[PDB]
Amino acid sequence: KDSKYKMSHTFESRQSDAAKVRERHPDRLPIICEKVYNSDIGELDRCKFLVPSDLTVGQFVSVLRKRVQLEAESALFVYTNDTVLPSSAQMADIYSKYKDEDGFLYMKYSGEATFG
Amino acid sequence: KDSKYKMSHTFESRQSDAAKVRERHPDRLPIICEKVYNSDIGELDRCKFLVPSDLTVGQFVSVLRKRVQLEAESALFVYTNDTVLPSSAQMADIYSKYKDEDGFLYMKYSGEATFG
Ligand SMILES: [Ca+2]
Ligand SMILES: [Ca+2]
Ligand SMILES: [Ca+2]
Ligand SMILES: [Ca+2]
């Protein structure tokens, strides 16, 4: 399923937002983080992350985990372009390859639970 | 709740029309825009629109409003796949996802008045 954030904000406002992020906070990467449609995990009110460009996928996940409040016993996965991410990857490599035209990196997250 | 335009125009004349418009006008999306069945709003002679690719839904709705002659206080809604489009959606995104087999995006519109 498509991004609920993309849908509810105009491209021009999204593009200007992402560019104002990387100008005011040049050390950061503008990230949109939304729940995988399928999963039993809670949606974030504030799905925009200004992520230190020195983070690995694994570190951003730890940061994301603090917000979703998922039981630490449960795994948390993240996705760009419909493919799960290895925690070893550098957020800043994921950003440059997979960034949207508006300048945001759109990510999905899921725990281990799914509906069907 | 089906398309009058589709009934009165041939499939391969439609497909050929959409690609002709697309080649003559590269930055414009081919839209068929028809009234919701039960709405009190006027059809629309005149239902093909060559929409600038960068228009939001709300900018397209401003264009349609002038043509349909709906009072300012009165709301105007557009639909595709049978669901209301948000004003912040991009016509390019809606086109990409929802375009017909024949290459037109088929939309419907209504004001707030309906027949019981
Ligand atoms: Ca939150
Ligand atoms: Ca053009
Ligand atoms: Ca007309
Ligand atoms: Ca656009």
Side-chain angles (χ1 to χ4, degrees), chain A, chain B residues 2-116:
Chain A
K1 272 260 95 276
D2 296 335
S3 170
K4 285 196 202 147
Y5 188 94
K6 184 173 266 206
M7 187 67 140
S8 56
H9 307 254
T10 71
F11 171 81
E12 199 194 284
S13 89
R14 279 150 39 212
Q15 183 188 47
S16 295
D17 190 6
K20 203 184 96 156
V21 158
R22 284 158 79 33
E23 178 260 308
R24 197 151 96 266
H25 306 270
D27 54 325
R28 314 219 161 209
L29 302 164
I31 269 80
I32 304 297
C33 213
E34 300 172 281
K35 74 168 270 181
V36 168
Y37 160 84
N38 294 261
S39 46
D40 194 19
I41 202 149
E43 190 71 285
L44 300 172
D45 284 344
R46 312 128 84 216
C47 69
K48 206 183 320 162
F49 289 86
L50 282 49
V51 177
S53 197
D54 48 310
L55 262 49
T56 55
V57 166
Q59 285 164 293
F60 171 65
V61 167
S62 278
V63 174
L64 179 61
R65 184 185 282 277
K66 299 166 201 96
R67 328 300 193 125
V68 298
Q69 290 150 40
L70 214 207
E71 278 81 293
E73 204 86 53
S74 287
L76 179 56
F77 307 97
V78 292
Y79 306 84
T80 334
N81 196 36
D82 227 64
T83 101
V84 72
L85 284 179
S87 45
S88 325
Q90 303 303 144
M91 280 299 286
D93 285 343
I94 312 298
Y95 176 80
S96 319
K97 189 167 172 160
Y98 298 106
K99 67 196 195 174
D100 195 83
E101 165 89 2
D102 65 12
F104 278 112
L105 174 72
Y106 288 77
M107 305 182 69
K108 307 255 90 183
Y109 61 92
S110 178
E112 305 183 77
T114 306
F115 289 103
Chain B
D2 291 344
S3 179
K4 277 169 182 172
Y5 192 89
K6 267 197 179 154
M7 278 158 166
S8 57
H9 301 253
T10 289
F11 18 101
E12 99 242 290
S13 70
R14 272 152 28 197
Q15 197 163 58
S16 172
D17 190 4
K20 284 198 296 278
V21 151
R22 266 284 209 151
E23 269 171 314
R24 285 167 42 103
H25 300 276
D27 281 4
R28 287 183 186 266
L29 315 165
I31 271 68
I32 299 292
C33 198
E34 291 165 295
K35 71 174 274 166
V36 161
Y37 160 75
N38 50 75
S39 46
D40 182 35
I41 198 157
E43 204 80 283
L44 275 214
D45 279 316
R46 302 214 324 160
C47 76
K48 213 180 309 149
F49 285 84
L50 273 36
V51 182
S53 64
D54 61 300
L55 254 52
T56 66
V57 161
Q59 295 166 330
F60 178 72
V61 163
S62 292
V63 168
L64 198 244
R65 177 180 289 276
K66 293 170 161 210
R67 283 274 299 283
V68 100
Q69 291 168 0
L70 190 64
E71 223 293 292
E73 305 267 34
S74 315
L76 182 55
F77 304 93
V78 297
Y79 306 89
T80 213
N81 184 219
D82 225 62
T83 141
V84 247
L85 296 169
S87 141
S88 47
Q90 289 302 324
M91 291 297 290
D93 293 327
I94 306 306
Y95 185 76
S96 282
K97 188 179 168 179
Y98 294 98
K99 65 179 174 194
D100 191 78
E101 88 231 307
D102 74 18
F104 283 114
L105 183 67
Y106 286 85
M107 307 178 74
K108 274 148 167 54
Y109 64 86
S110 179
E112 297 171 278
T114 65
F115 296 105

Short mmCIF file of all heavy atoms in Angstrom, two decimals, chain A residues 65 70-76 112:
data_model
loop_
_atom_site.label_atom_id
_atom_site.label_comp_id
_atom_site.label_asym_id
_atom_site.label_seq_id
_atom_site.Cartn_x
_atom_site.Cartn_y
_atom_site.Cartn_z
N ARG A 65 12.30 2.04 17.57
CA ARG A 65 11.76 1.15 18.62
C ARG A 65 11.32 1.90 19.88
O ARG A 65 10.32 1.53 20.52
CB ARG A 65 12.79 0.07 18.97
CG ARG A 65 12.31 -0.96 19.97
CD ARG A 65 13.42 -1.92 20.36
NE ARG A 65 13.68 -2.95 19.36
CZ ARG A 65 13.00 -4.09 19.24
NH1 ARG A 65 11.97 -4.37 20.04
NH2 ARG A 65 13.35 -4.96 18.30
N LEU A 70 7.38 -1.19 21.07
CA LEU A 70 7.32 -2.62 20.84
C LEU A 70 8.12 -3.34 21.91
O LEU A 70 9.27 -2.96 22.18
CB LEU A 70 7.91 -2.96 19.46
CG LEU A 70 7.41 -4.08 18.55
CD1 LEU A 70 8.55 -4.57 17.65
CD2 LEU A 70 6.74 -5.24 19.28
N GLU A 71 7.52 -4.37 22.51
CA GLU A 71 8.20 -5.26 23.46
C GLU A 71 9.59 -5.61 22.94
O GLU A 71 9.73 -6.08 21.81
CB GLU A 71 7.39 -6.54 23.66
CG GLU A 71 6.23 -6.43 24.65
CD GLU A 71 4.98 -5.80 24.05
OE1 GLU A 71 5.01 -4.59 23.72
OE2 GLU A 71 3.96 -6.51 23.92
N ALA A 72 10.61 -5.36 23.76
CA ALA A 72 12.01 -5.55 23.34
C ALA A 72 12.34 -6.99 22.94
O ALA A 72 13.37 -7.27 22.32
CB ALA A 72 12.97 -5.06 24.43
N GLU A 73 11.43 -7.91 23.28
CA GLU A 73 11.55 -9.31 22.89
C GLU A 73 11.24 -9.51 21.40
O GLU A 73 11.67 -10.49 20.79
CB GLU A 73 10.61 -10.16 23.74
CG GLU A 73 11.01 -11.61 23.86
CD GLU A 73 12.00 -11.85 24.98
OE1 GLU A 73 11.70 -11.44 26.12
OE2 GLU A 73 13.05 -12.46 24.71
N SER A 74 10.49 -8.57 20.82
CA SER A 74 10.06 -8.67 19.44
C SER A 74 11.00 -7.96 18.48
O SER A 74 11.46 -6.84 18.75
CB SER A 74 8.65 -8.13 19.28
OG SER A 74 7.70 -9.03 19.84
N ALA A 75 11.28 -8.62 17.35
CA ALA A 75 11.99 -8.01 16.24
C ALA A 75 11.17 -6.88 15.60
O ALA A 75 9.94 -6.88 15.65
CB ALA A 75 12.36 -9.05 15.21
N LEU A 76 11.90 -5.94 15.01
CA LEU A 76 11.36 -4.81 14.28
C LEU A 76 12.09 -4.73 12.96
O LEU A 76 13.32 -4.66 12.93
CB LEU A 76 11.56 -3.51 15.08
CG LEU A 76 11.09 -2.16 14.53
CD1 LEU A 76 9.59 -2.15 14.17
CD2 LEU A 76 11.43 -1.05 15.54
N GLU A 112 6.83 -8.68 14.09
CA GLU A 112 6.72 -10.06 13.61
C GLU A 112 5.27 -10.47 13.34
O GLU A 112 5.04 -11.44 12.64
CB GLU A 112 7.40 -11.04 14.58
CG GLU A 112 8.86 -10.69 14.86
CD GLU A 112 9.56 -11.70 15.76
OE1 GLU A 112 9.93 -12.77 15.24
OE2 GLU A 112 9.76 -11.41 16.97
#
